[PDB]
Amino acid sequence: LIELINSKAEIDDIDHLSNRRVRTVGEQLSQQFGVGLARMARTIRERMN
DNA sequence: GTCGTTAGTTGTGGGACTAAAGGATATCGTGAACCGAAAAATTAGTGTAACGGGTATCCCACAACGCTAG
């Protein structure tokens, strides 16, 4: 950031395709599964409690 | 030296963002036990047939002439 302030570096490009990532079907389903399994684990922990 | 004033920020908050059509969604986690309420189902108990006159109505059939003599 300091090097950027002295006009010695470059600003990142928001629309660059290396800076735009693709969330595929597998990733979205994995994230939703993680949410569901976290809820299930909380329920299991409380039931054991 | 100290206190109120004014203007120019600066951060923060509230309010706008064509028209036409259409218009489907999915929605966790659980603690027990007894009493009261009303809504529902099951059970217990009584019964007619023809007759007298007299008369209201119905259907059903028939009549409602023609001639002669005292």
Side-chain angles (χ1 to χ4, degrees), chain A residues 2-46:
Chain A
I2 288 146
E3 184 172 26
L4 206 66
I5 282 165
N6 326 315
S7 310
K8 281 195 179 162
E10 316 135 301
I11 290 305
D12 278 324
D13 191 338
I14 174 67
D15 307 316
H16 210 266
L17 261 200
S18 80
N19 288 324
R20 305 190 88 181
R21 193 177 166 271
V22 174
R23 250 195 266 264
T24 49
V25 46
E27 211 186 313
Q28 304 191 56
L29 272 173
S30 206
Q31 153 186 357
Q32 299 299 325
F33 251 71
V35 173
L37 266 172
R39 302 235 219 92
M40 187 193 293
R42 156 261 262 157
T43 288
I44 290 163
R45 202 209 328 180
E46 189 49 68

